[model samples]
Target: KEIPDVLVDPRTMKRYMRGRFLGKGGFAKCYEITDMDTKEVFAGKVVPKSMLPHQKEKMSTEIAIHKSLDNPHVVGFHGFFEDDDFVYVVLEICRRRSLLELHKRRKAVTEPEARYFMRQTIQGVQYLHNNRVIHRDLKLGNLFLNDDMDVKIGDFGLATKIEFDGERKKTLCGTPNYIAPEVLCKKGHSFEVDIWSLGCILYTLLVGKPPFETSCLKETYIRIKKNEYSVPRHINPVASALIRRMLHADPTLRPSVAELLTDEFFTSGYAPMRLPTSCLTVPPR
Candidate 1:
């Protein structure tokens, strides 16, 4: 495979060495890197300076958001450094793969497993909400697991901070599959949008499919608007009730992260599978 043209530590001014390409998205590429100074491994996301004209401002916002957020369930950003050709961000290396990959392996997660994951997701999102940052994108792919099997929410490129008592935002963003109804309609929305995405994630986890899926994107949006979906009859009644409340058409009716923590589904005596600290512990690796 041809190597990406972008260079890391272009000027040899930084104390880190890029190792292998990990993955790529629309605007950025991530790599496994080693810190020469600390000898610690980290995932370094590099964006070409040319690709982002407003690099300074965007990078600044990312730094601020990450600095303010420090939770085991949330990916931690160490710092930002740049060279003449690229912008590099050092973050915790999550080696256990994404929730997306997990879904692919199992086809779907059991309700107990889904609840376990949801609990971690809620903890991370609650931290962001408390800090007043909105994680606009909260899909399965963005949810990562480390070698310890601990879930950590990643990818903050779409995050924004809202002031207390601030007006709702009108910007339309996030993946269509997990976007809220109000956002799909191009109406103003707020932190509640995150809850909507969480609902979609929980539903997918329990049923192995999105509730509003259709052959056409338009139909999916229509379903979202009408709240046209139901919990699978196989799911426990408690889980079903919680999922239904989360998928409510009215954003205001959806439960907040704090509210969700109080729900019986989350707080009830359901024991989660013990997460292994070594990836090798995963069956048939």
Candidate 2:
């Protein structure tokens, strides 16, 4: 199956030419696509209808949530449409890729660097929670980085919108290592689940591995269920304390998105307003 040289969106009366490949995930392959008329570039996620199978509703849900989001720290959703054979979602191109790649290249990033990234991430999460949406999956991979080194949250496949106050989502879904204990226990959960994942992300950024990671899936789940993980002794006390609070076994004990930025760890550290792109591969000077 070949991707069309020109992607035609009849609904929007727009044509895009797929350029270089960005990356691929379980259901879609991302490409650098440019609007033929405006020459604007976007990260076009193209999914073959064959891959959708019985998951069309899931795809629509993801599109609906992502399309409604707009924030400096959230990935921009430009447009989306489908042709005869594929579904195309046009999103902002984070040329620098995701934080996962950066973490892989530079293990245990500097405290200031983590502070900067986490601050931006929390701001984005705050916006999502305020809007009554829970980003069920908040990991390094979903935290994208642009050329400016800004953290933009993306990938809304597992995200859910809360309908009213006291609503709790019972879906047992999330990445293994970053999953909240409440989710694993099959209990209903809410926005606090994202905070738990944020704690895992913060720990991984500072300590170089996921908080509850293990060689086997069963072992990892056990650790997460037991709330058993240790922050390195050498980490800043404030930062370590914050991580613990975020990773508390009880979801109600986790920090709210709004309070995350005001945590002592962020306030006591030197978070740069803008990070140099070089931080992607090496520690900032």
Candidate 3:
């Protein structure tokens, strides 16, 4: 199949050379597109739209949330352009595709490597929490790695808020493997659900698979409820212990975003891995 060699955003009046497919979702195929001229680098997501009531509402909500966010630990929204039935979301492309891809490339990572990325993940999560926004879906695939291998929590389709007007969230939403037990039991959750998902992600980094994942969905749900899972780590005891604490069945037992920041496993002597010169050389979008 031959995709068009050229395309233009009717709204932006900018020329572009559409590239390969990046990823896809329901009712859309996201491709990697770029400016035909300036910005020697970066990726753009092109999702064709539908007037279907449900999808239209969801797509509009997601685009609205993305443009409002500003964080280095988050994938930057350069903006978007719509051309009848499609919306192109231009984002700060990561050097690495995603954390899930990173783990798959390496099988697993060392404690120091895990710690290095975890801090950045926490920073992003904490920021969202403070802003009263909740990314109900926080799985490895949703967590992207920037040019420096830092985390940028993307895919906020299920993201919503708690306007702090005396509200309690009860959204039974999230990838099955990462959903907090409290959320599963319909116990009415809070932002702690994100902490639970973070725990699962941390475990995946160390072990190459999420804790409580199973061939059977029902069993996976049961395992989550029981908090029954082995933490196998030849990495570091400190790291393993933190995983245990993070994956605690009781959401309240899981460390808060602030507590996780100060934990020894993350703070003992971690250092930042800066963006590479090559990554820095690219023109900003």
lDDT (CA) per prediction: 0.79, 0.92, 0.76
Clashing pairs in 1: none
Better-scoring candidate (TM-score), 1 or 3: 1
In candidate 1 the C-alpha lDDT for residue 101 amounts to 79
Candidate 1 per-residue lDDT, tens place, 142-165, comes to: 999987778899988778898868
The prediction achieving the highest lDDT against the true structure is: 2
Worst 10 residues of 3 by lDDT: 276-285
Indicate the TM-score of model 2. 0.98
> How many residue pairs collide in each prediction?
0, 0, 0
lDDT, candidate 1, equals 0.79
Candidate 2 minimal-lDDT segment of 10 residues: 50-59
Model 3 clash pairs are none
TM-score of each: 0.88, 0.98, 0.86
**Any runs in candidate 2 off by more than 4 Å, and if so which?**
none
RMSD of every candidate to native, in Å, equals: 3.4, 0.9, 4.8
